[PDB]
Every structure is written in C-alpha cells, then in structure tokens.
Amino acid sequence: ISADQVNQIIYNLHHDPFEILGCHLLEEGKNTKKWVVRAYLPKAEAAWVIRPTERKEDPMNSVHHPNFFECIIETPELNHYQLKVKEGEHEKVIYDPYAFSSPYLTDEDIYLFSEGNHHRIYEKLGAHVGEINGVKGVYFAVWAPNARNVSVIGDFNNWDGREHQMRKRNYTIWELFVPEIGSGTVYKYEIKNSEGHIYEKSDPYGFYREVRPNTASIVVDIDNIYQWHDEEWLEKRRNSDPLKQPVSVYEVHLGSWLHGSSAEKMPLLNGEADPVIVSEWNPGARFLSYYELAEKLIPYVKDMGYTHIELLPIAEHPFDGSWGYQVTGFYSPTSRFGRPEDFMYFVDKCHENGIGVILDWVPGHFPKDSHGLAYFDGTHLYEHADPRIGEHKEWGTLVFNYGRHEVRNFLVANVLFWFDKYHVDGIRVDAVASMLYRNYLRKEGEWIANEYGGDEHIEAVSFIREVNTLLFEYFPGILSIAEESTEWEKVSRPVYDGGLGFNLKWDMGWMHDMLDYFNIDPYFRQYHQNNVTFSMAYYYNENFMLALSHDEIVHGKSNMLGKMPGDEWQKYANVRALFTYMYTHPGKKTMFMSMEFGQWSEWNVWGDLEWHLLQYEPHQQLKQFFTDLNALYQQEPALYTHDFEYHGFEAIDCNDNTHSVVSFLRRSDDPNDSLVVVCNFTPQPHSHYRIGVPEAGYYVELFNSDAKQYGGSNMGNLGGKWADEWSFHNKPYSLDLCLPPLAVLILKLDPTKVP
Template sequence: MLANELNQAKLHNPFDFLGLQINQDSKHSLIRAWIPHAIKVEVIDFKTNQSVGELTQIDALGLFEANFDDLDDNFTYYFKVSNAEHTYEVTDPYQFQEQAFHAVHYVGTKPENIYQQLGAQLIELDTAQGKISATRFAVFAPNASSVSVIGDFNHWDGRYHIMQKTQCGHWVLVIPNVNAGTRYKYEIKDPTGNSLPHKSDPVGFYADQYPSHASIVFDHSQYQWNDSEWLESQAKVNRYKSPMAIYELHAGSWKPHYNEKGPQALSYHQLADELIAYVKDMGYTHIELMPISEHPYDGSWGYQPVGLFAPTSRFGSPDDFKYFVDQCHQNGVGVILDWVPAHFPEDGHGLARFDGTYVYEYEDPKRGWHPDWNSCIYDFGKDSVRQFLVASALIWLDKFHIDALRVDAVASMLYWDYSRDEGEWVPNIDGGNENYEAVSLLRWFNKEVYGKYPHAFTIAEESTAFPKVSRPVFEGGLGFGFKWNMGWMHDSLHFISKDPAYRKYHHNEITFSMVYAYNENFVLPISHDEVVHGKGSLLRKMPGDEWQAAANQRAYAGFMYAHPGKKLNFMGNDIGQSAEWNHAGSVDWYLLEYEKHKGIQNLYRKLNQLYTEYPALYEKDHEAGGFEWVEHQDSGQSILSFIRKAESSEQKVYVVSNFTPVPHEGYRIGVKDKGTYKLLLSTDEQIYWGSDFLSNTHFEAQDIAWQGQEKSIMIDLPPLATVYIVYE
C-alpha cells in the first residue's frame, strides 16, 4: 500500500514513513527509503564516512528499510545507491523534517515572510561532517492531495521528492545539494488525485522561458549594491515639491539591436549602458518600466504576469536587473516599476486553479473572471492572497531597490461592476458596486510601502472619480502618493486632435482640468495606452500639414510641462514618433536624421531642463497657490495664459499657449510686477523646427492694466506655440 502511494506520488505525509524513524520506547530505530530503480542502498554515517548497514528491499517498486541500534536524533547520513547502471551518493531529504517545517513558522506574521520563507530558499544543513548546501522548498497548495518537487535533480520524476503537507496548507521539503541555477517545478495532484499541469513556483525568483517555464533556484545574497547614497538622499525628498519627469518605456522594444535573427532586445546590462545615457541627456528624472515581472506572452507587454517575484529572464538574471537599477541610482535616475495585482492569466503553469481549486482567484466567475483581459481576478478577501500580493510588491523595494510602484488597473479592482453589464456582477454586502476587499488591500499595501521603505512612493493608474486615491489612509484615502490624471489626458488629447478652426468649440476641454487639479496628487500621463491599438502616435493625433502637426505637438508639450502635475511621456513621444507603438518593433530612432524630429527631441530636452531648473514649474504642483489663470476664456482665438508660482522664491513663470496657426503681433499679457521679463522658451524656435516668429527675449512691464493684472507686457505670439516668460 505504502509503496503504491509512493510510486504514484500520492502521499501527503512522507515524513511519517520515510527517513530516520526514532522509536522512543526502545533503542531501535528504523531508516526507510523510497528510491525507485535502486537495487542496493547502503547507509553511510556523515561523521565517520563509514557504512552503518544496508537497507533491505521490501518492495520491488523501490521501498527499502532496516532497523538500527543506538541511533539518535543527531545522527545524519547519506545513501550509497546502486542501480542497474551505476552507483551514486544521495543525502536523504527525509531526515531534515525540522528544517523543512521552519519555512511555515513565520508565514502569515508579516507579508515579507512570503518571499523570505516560501519558494526555493537556499540554506545550509548541519551534518556530523559539517555544513552542506541545500534548498528548502515550500509552496501553498491547501487543497492538493499531494505535491512533489520535480526538476533537473530527479529527472522531473514526481516519485522522488514528495513533499509534506502542513496544517496551514503549505507543502515543504528540504533537498540537499540542490544549488542556485537548478530548474524545478511542482507536480500537484488535485483533491481527488488527478494530475495537474506542472506548476511554476508562485514565489519563484527566477524563471526559464518558453517552452519549459520552469522556476530556477536563485541566490539573492550575492549582489553587492552601491546605491546607499541614493537611497539615503531619496528618503529625505519631498516628492510633491520636487520635479518628476518620467520616461515610460517597454524594455523589449525600446532599442533592440538587429542581427540575422531579427530584432534582439537589449539585456539589462545593455539597457544600463544605453538607456541611462539617453535619459540623462534628455533630462528625465525617472524611468518607468512597463511590467518586467515574469510573463509568458510577449504580446501582453507584461500585464499578464505569472511570476510576481521575478524580473523576466528575457533580458538577463535577477542580478542583471539589480545591476540596471544600481546603475540608474548611481547616475541619479529613479526607477518606477509597473506592478499588476489586479489579475493574472490562465496559463497552465501559473496560478489559475493552482491545486485544482481556486487558491488565488475568486471562485464565482462574476467576481473571478475579467471580461476585458480574459484573465483571473485575485480574491482580495483571502488572507493568503493578500499576504502574497503585498509581499510581491515589497520584494521589488527590498531585493531590487525600486523607487516606486505604479499600480496597474486600480479602477478594475475597486468596482465589482467594472466593465460588466447588469447581471454580470455581484454587489457588495451593502448592495453597492465597491469592492471593500480591494480597497482594504490597497490601503494595506500603501501603509506597508510607506512604513518600511522611506525612499519609495506609489502611483495609481485609476480612471474614475473614486475619492482620495492619493490621500493618506489616516484621512480615509487609499494611501497612494500620486494618481494618473486620466481626465486631463483624455480631454487635452481630444482638444489638440481637433482642427484649430474647431478648437474654439472645445475650449473648456483644455481648461477644465483646473477645476479638479488639486483633488489628487496628479501625474500627467501620455502613456503607451495612448499610442497603440489604432490610436496612432502622439504626432499622428495632430491635425494639419506636416509643419502644423509638428507645431501642434510642440505647443501641446509646452502646455503639458507648464500644467500642474508631474510629467510622464512614453518612449517615442519625445522624438515625434510617426508610427504607433509596436511591442515587437522599436522606437524609430532613424527619424532623428530629419530636422523635424530632431527639433521635437530638442524641445523635450529643453522642457525637461526648464522643468527641473525652475521651481515655479514644480514646487506647488499640488497646491492651488501655485497656479493662477491670466486668461482662460479667449475661446475665439484658442489662446490661454496662466502663471506658475514658486514657493521658495518670488519666481513666476508666465505661460501663453496659442492653439491656432494665426500669429499675433503685439499680443498683450497681463503681469503682476514691474520690471523686466525674460523669455525662457518658445516652442516655435527654429531649433525646434519652428518659424522663429518671436524674436525678442526681454520684455518691459508697462503700467497698463490688462486681463485683471495691474501691468502688462507685449509679445509677438507665434502660431501653434507655447511660450514661457519668467519674472524673477
């Protein structure tokens, strides 16, 4: 009976039968071993390196045992095994029960114990001969009938390393002499004993690519960081009063190199060499990576992850990714990572119905299935899932020193009826559509991040009017540091895409954002979502001939950088990418051979420079006192003007945007102070491929009241342009 259960890998308690079984009532002890295909098994004492006896084969399938006298709990041993082909040595994993159970003693007390205890943890075992290396495996599969570790070390045969089930639903086993770099998976049988597809480790730190999708044992202790100075400085930064210009990119299609096999994505080391240099040259403060959590399908862009604890091995090892982050920090560039806790794909090797039941996802498809993305939704009410998700966030801050997490698809988490029709969702306990469990999880996540990592911050991609997304939890908020301003993005892009002749009918779309600009701590995003799936590139959204389209984008970029809120641009925007983004392609860097695109790039470089150099453009991004309209009702001419004000000085930057191709000579602007005003920027300058209509660089205030101000200046306002003028 026992041999049959072992041969079918259907045992849930191997420690009760295998290994050293001490009889407390006598001096006799039993050693029992399960080694399929063996014909002879000898027990070797680690202390003396001598044989203490041979086990007797009691079943032809591979079960051996023998009684021994005077063995105690401290006796450690290995087997000398002979089969039909050769003789080899193997240390019995079933003598290390205490070390195996160590994994589950701390799980549940704090979320980081998930990645500190579960998965494949490299440890050392004490033997009479000294310490030997081993890997402790632990996986949560509460409803499985049996679980085995399979891998390179046992020919992917589930009969060799059957795991022990614990009371809390984890399965554990220590396997000696399994080291970093070893591939493995879990062979799981469902509650009725049926075999499931082999599963990757939910808490795996490193993964093989298609077709195996195997997890790989990894040692997180080897990398030596050199960014302590950065982390210490960032912990002291007031992010709300500091500039934040974010360059969002997809690592695989940023700048692939080409060879006979086609486009080859840059490695993490190559990205460190080439991307950081570009970002520094352009003046961005942060890089935002679309998800690099391990994911099986390139076409998901990383938003269908199966490995929330592992950077994708497409571009290198976890240590290679650490090197990339380390180099960013040493060069003064922050790293933001997209994190996806909303849903996960159904791939057989992943989390879906992990042990044959709904371990990670809601069981009811009206709650557990996402119609937009054909994916599973995490059960945000289960403590095991909540611990898992929060741990998956913290590991990026802990092991990889990430500066911020941008949380994807928050709106889909907050509402039961998100993208669902009547009858396709289940209301909450109060009959409403708010998912209280997700709200609770997000608040906990933010408290953990801000409580444990003072250098870090969080950003929500949230598209609804859910209140206080970027307000502290103690004020009743969700606790995020920032929120993407999807309303500004939608309205302003809709406005700028109109023919200038019709913009006067849509003037409120370019001004309406200031009605709610301080409800949240906003980031202004022109992200990947706006330049894909037939939406066209940012340049292609612009109306008019070639010159007008480029001028429209430049005027829009100038307006964006002056508008309250932190800035985010997707790769390609800043060179006037012509084609929309293709994840299998590349940014069209060859466009920089042309003056138009070089000019657009020059403008974005200048905008980043001015934005980070002039406190008026960022210090009061999230306070009403940092912005004042000068003229926002001139819809007939599609001209608007406003002031940005500094907190640390009297600095004021006056911003004027002309969204028509009509130039205005002698255009008067109301100003507050007497004295000289200096031109900081005109997006119409020749260096940006403009017409250079505005030639003056200094303007004297006149005692002529205008636009509600006591004084005024006159400029020649260029067509389709934004102008910055500073008073200091």
C-alpha cells in the first residue's frame, strides 16, 4: 500500500475503507496464497495478527503512519484470525472489524458452512441490520435445504409472507433482504415442506425472542446496543492460567434467586418493560431483569467473596420447569429477564467487580417443541433420523446429529458466540455421558454399536474435542467444565493426549462420599472413614471441581441442613465442617444459592429463595462463615496454587476412624504459606490431640469453624499453639491441640514470632 491511500483512511477521505482494511488476497502460489491484513488502530503502538486455530501469531508493521498497520501472511486460506492491539501498557484481542464487506452470504461463507467450519456463521445466518443496493434494512437467512418454500412473516407484513418469499441459495440456504425495517422487528419463518405442509418456526440463529410462551424472534442490532468496559478483565484472563487461581463459584438459577412484584414494570437499562409473571399460580410475583440482577446479585456475590457466578442455562427456553436444560433458542439470552443489552450489562458489571461468569451450556439435546429445531425443514435436519441415536426416549427429547456438518457448525459456533458477543468466562456442560455413549439409557436391542463394535458415540466425541480445541485457541484463559458420570477417561485433559479437552471435571464421587458421609449419625462415621480419605491414585487423573450443586437439594434430598443428623446446633456445625473441609480439600469449589445462609427447604424453581431467614442470627452467622471462608480462600495461596500437583497436598493422619479425625497439609510456592488442616467430624471435643507438623515454630489458629461468630461453641487454641519437639505421624515436630466439636481448624506457621 501507498501513503496517499493511507492518508485517505487516516483523515476520512476514503470512499470505501473495506477496499483497503481487512484481509485481501495479494497472489496465488502453487500450494498456498499470500494475503495482507490491514488495520487502522488509532492510539495503538503495536499489533499482531493471531491465527488461533493454526497456533500462530504474526506481528503487524506500521506503514506510512504510526497507527496504520499491515501484515503479510502466507497460507492457503485465511478464514480465522484475530487482531491483538497494544495501546500503552494494555492489550486487547478482537475480531477484525473490517472482516465482512457485505451483509449477505458469499460463496466463501456457504462453502465454509458446508464443511462445518464457519466459526462466525452467526454473522450471516439469522437476522442482521445492514445495507444492500444502497438501502438500510434487514437481511435474513436460514438453513433449510429440503424445504419447498420459505417466507418471512412478521409485524411488518401482518404475518402474510406472500410478498416476502425468500430465495434459495446453493440448494441449501434461504435468504431475503427487507428494506426499511430494523431492530425490534418481530418475525418468524413460514415454511412449506416437501409434502406441502405449511408451519411456522422461530429463527434458530435468532438473537432475541418474545417472552414465553410466545415464540416470535426479534431482530437485534447486536453490535450497536451496548458499550463494554471490561478490557482490563479480558486481558488479565487471557494472560493467566485459571487452574492456578482461586475459583469459588456461586451457582445461581436466575429465575428463582429473587422475585419482585408484578404490580410494577420491569426496569431495564435506560428503559422498562412489562412484568414477566413467574406463574399463573403466583401472579403477584415477577422475575427480575438482567439489569436488576446486576444491581442486586452482583454486590451480593462480591460481599460473599465468590470469584465466579455460574448460571443455569440462560439460552431461550420455553418451560420454566426445565430449569433451562431444554433449549429452543440457542442464540438468545432468555427474554424472561429483559434484553440482550441488559445481560451484556450484567456481564460487564461482573467484570467490573472482579467476578467471572460461567454458563451452563446445553449441546446434548433439544426438545420437540414445534417452534424450535425439530424436524426443521420437513426432515430430520438438526436431529439424527434414526431414533436409536437421535432421541433420548426417556427424556422425551431429540439428540443433535453431531456428524452432520451444518449441525456441528450450529453448535460450535454457538459456544464461541457466547464468548464473542457476551464476553463470558466459561462454560459447564451437564450430563456429558449423554453425548458420549451410543447406548445411553437404551435397553438391549434398542441401540447399535459404532463402526468398530464399541459403545462410544464417535461423532459426539469428535464434536466435543472440536468445541474445546477451538474455545481455548480463541479464548485461552477460560473455564470449560464437564460433569461426566461414568468414569470416562481424560475428561479434563488435552485433546492431543487423547482427552476431551475440558480443564475441569465435577467430582461426583467426592460429592456422593461427602453427602453419604455427613448424613450418617456421628457415632457411625467410624465405619465410613474411607469417604473422608483422600485417594491420590483417583484424584490426580483429572482437574477436579468440587461441586455441591442444585441437583443435590431438590426431589426429596433436602437442603444442606436437613441432610444433617443431630439437633439444630449440630446440623449447622455439620454444614460448617463439611464446607470448611471442602474449601481445604484440593480442587476448585462450586456451591448453589441458598446453601450459604442455611435455607431449610429444598430449592423450588417456581418461587424465590427464603430471604426472610436472614432476619435471624443462625442464618446470619452461617452467612458470615461463608463470607470469611471465601476471603480466606482468596488470601491463602496453599488453598489454590497447587490443587493439581502432588506438592499441594500431603496426608498427615487418616486412621483415627474411631474418632473420625482427619488431618492434612496444603502447600504452595513459598514453604511459609503451608497450612495445617485438622478436622473433627464428631461432637466429641478433644483437649489434647497431637498432630505432626513439618517445622518447629508458632502455628496461628488461622481459621476455626467452631468460632462463636459462626454459631459455634468457641472452643479452640486461643490464638495458636507452639510446636513441641516431639516426633509424631512420621514428622519431626508436633502440636498438642484442642479440637472443637464438629469442626475444622486451619493453622499456619508464623515464622516471625517472639519465642
């Protein structure tokens, strides 16, 4: 490029910047091509072109002006890249804003989509505000290869699509531009299938939707509705390893955390909307918006001291009672809580308060609801045609055909979508077994094996690896969490080592051992000491997430307190002991809303939590307990730097089953950060209990779950205890401790203390 051309860009005299900025072919070689990417980045000193899927990074050079950059790259195709931009001391990563000249699909789009590799297909499929033949309007497009005809119906044509019949392209995708209309437009696709049958569909790539039980899609100008402020958070995340950081997650179901009154409007971000009544049976209650949740949930979580909030599925879903696990609008945040910008605001605000956001994502199945994906074009399009692999008969749902390219693409681009447009920090996938096995919940003779006679669902496995491969390449630094319940191997290991590519796995075994154990009367826990006995062999095969989830306080299992034996004082003590144990055991942490204040009743998705309990001291104390423990967890490196290395944990003694006492060390980079943890899982206190430690010195009583401010009896070691030179448990020195009843202590050597 020339200076004259650069100047035309810098000073806004150029008639079409897309001619120059973005990616352009320079020439074709025998087996490769030569491209240039150009970018005008005012205030940037430096830039790079990232090719995350090829694992490459090329720097850009300033050209004729300090803020005009180019980068010449040789490669056969250059479909997938990002720009890294440095302003002062800060970097950001972004998609190239001059990536797409036109709103309509190109041959190249269509080709990539057919191969299942269009990582940004949602830029072209769905509905997008743009300009064609010099007029502003909306471009629509939808994949429906076997349809006889498709038309766009909506407010703008009184639901009569005779003058808005779409044009089929490449025997595969229907499109139409409609001038003059814009964002807010309400619409569906009217489809005629091969038999002549006519029926309406919501837009599978729709970005917003009417409020359930209505189903029309709504047009959104998704790149011009919200201004972000979270560059610093994103940079910090890209440049860190979250496995080495504290990760304490508050799991929340947005629809049942807190309700408001249906006698007023739902405030949104600079606006308001009609209330969304939680149910016909509770009509005085409405949902809170994403906006009101940002104002209320976020400072709450910040005070509690959690690092992340994990949301039950927020993709658009028709039935509250599914909890979100049955999705019909994969590309829109549910309209129960307001608008897409309101949820952007929610994420932006978590990030301003140093809180991350993890989404439950549901790629395993979808329901039969006739507005959604089912039998989409009068064939089994999204779902596989054979019900032995394409239905979960016991759940009443359909299973995506992962081997079909445009279906894989639907899903893979969807996961990337949430990271791109809504800046989320991770995902969690429920019931991963449901994808992995060809015989899942299927009786004998009612399923078929793979091409090698195995039970492994090959296509699905391959899809899962692509999802995790691409996520981490595009957004290093995120969390990809799996719950997999069949001891499948290498869930949270890299795809290159034969793993599924997640970086964390829920420890369901740990969960059952914990809840079976605390449920047993204290006397009888001596017969079940193996539950509280760390198992090196199993633990280090996965990066574990210790989750006490929503699934464990429904359907007659009781909430946490109800699970525990004893009188009221003991039930609380049990909760404090279990969770103090959980925060000290290796692994990341997840707990569900209502557990942190001792809700007595089971989570009920149709109401909100029992906030009135926080008027009373026991509930308050338990909440101060979680507040302090989260603070502790963030301040003590040995609780998070080495969850997944041998160094991080060492058992001290695990054999006093007769008293249900267990003890261990946690460690970090500095030996002075080591922590001694001692747990007493009965109501019997102990005035002299000797515990081996690694060094002489004074050990501070850093945490004590029996403290009176947590509702405990306040027994303890009054500040800490000098070690005796007295071998015990194969350790040179030892402590003679007071152990409080149903309680856990954490001690820490202060090596600068006056003997």
